[PDB]
Amino acid sequence: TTEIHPSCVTRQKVIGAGEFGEVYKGMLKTEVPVAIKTLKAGYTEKQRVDFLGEAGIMGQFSHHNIIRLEGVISKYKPMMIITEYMENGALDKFLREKDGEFSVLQLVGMLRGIAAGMKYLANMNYVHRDLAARNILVNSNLVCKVSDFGPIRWTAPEAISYRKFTSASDVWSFGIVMWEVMTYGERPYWELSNHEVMKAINDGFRLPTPMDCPSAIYQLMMQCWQQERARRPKFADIVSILDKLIRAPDSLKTLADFDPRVSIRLP
Numbered sequence: 183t184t185e186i187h188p189s190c191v192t193r194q195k196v197i198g199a200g201e202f203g204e205v206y207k208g209m210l211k212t213e214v215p216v217a218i219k220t221l222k223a224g225y226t227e228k229q230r231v232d233f234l235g236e237a238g239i240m241g242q243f244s245h246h247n248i249i250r251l252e253g254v255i256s257k258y259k260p261m262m263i264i265t266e267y268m269e270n271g272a273l274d275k276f277l278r279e280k281d282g283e284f285s286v287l288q289l290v291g292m293l294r295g296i297a298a299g300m301k302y303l304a305n306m307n308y309v310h311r312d313l314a315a316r317n318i319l320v321n322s323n324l325v326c327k328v329s330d331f332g333p334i335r336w337t338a339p340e341a342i343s344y345r346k347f348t349s350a351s352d353v354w355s356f357g358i359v360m361w362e363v364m365t366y367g368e369r370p371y372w373e374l375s376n377h378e379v380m381k382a383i384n385d386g387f388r389l390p391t392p393m394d395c396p397s398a399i400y401q402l403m404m405q406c407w408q409q410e411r412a413r414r415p416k417f418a419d420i421v422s423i424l425d426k427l428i429r430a431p432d433s434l435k436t437l438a439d440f441d442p443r444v445s446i447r448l449p
């Protein structure tokens with residue numbers, strides 16, 4: 183990681199909360215807009231270990247679809263993690279505010295980017311545990327980048343049941359993200375309670391197809407939701423399939439049947 187001097191950082195707006203400090207939007211000089219997570223006076227030993235350990239892991243990552251670390255302030259207080267700023271913000275909110283505005287190819291391109299970032303993380307032996315559209319950031323080129331903190335509806339059964347978090351439970355979450363993207367940010371399982379979601383999944387029910395969804399994309403998300411973890415595709419399989427669908431875009435024209443809930447009779 184690069185050490186940044188505090189005189190190069192201006193905090194402007196609070197945009198979130200950290201584990202022991204705030205997250206700001208600001209500017210970095212060397213101006214470029216940045217996001218800034220602070221660790222404030224009184225933090226514990228464990229919090230400092232986790233904060234600097236987070237900075238270190240982010241510093242190791244170098245991938246188009248992973249949020250970029252600009253640097254760290256560790257020699258002065260408050261300590262800070264400084265990342266690039268993504269002006270379109272979080273993917274879940276972004277899609278909900280732009281309902282129906284994108285082509286199928288654009289949406290699938292988003293998913294290919296997320297999958298490539300996740301393939302990289304899994305290969306680097308990083309298990310995310312919290313993959314969801316709320317943790318994806320979108321830039322002004324529509325590039326999606328994975329982010330993380332320092333979620334029953336998104337979590338694979340074995341991770342809920344016995345705390346087995348692996349890249350294969352991240353694949354389950356990726357399937358949910360696919361459904362979030364294709365529905366423009368609909369809440370998975372709608373108003374079902376957490377217990378009702380787990381009961382439905384255990385009974386074998388799965389989320390139905392989104393409207394206007396390519397058959398190939400629904401098939402892929404369904405295979406991410408296999409109960410047996412070993413049967414789920416790996417991220418390499420997901421990236422390969424999405425890349426081939428994008429490169430032969432007529433493949434996306436065949437749509438899965440949408441189960442209408444409302445039927446209107448007109449002559």
Ligand SMILES: Cc1ccc(C(=O)Nc2cccc(C(F)(F)F)c2)cc1Nc1nc(N2CCNCC2)nc(-n2ccnc2)n1
Nearest residue numbers: 217218219236249263265267268271316317328329330331
């Ligand atoms: C300052 C900051 C510090 C750390 C991280 C971060 O990602 N650490 C991380 C740790 C482990 C693994 C991964 C890995 F995923 F990469 F693997 C990533 C992101 C940001 N910066 C930042 N964080 C968020 N969020 C919101 C959603 N929840 C996550 C944090 N949003 C924005 N942001 C919003 C608009 N423009 C920018 N910036």
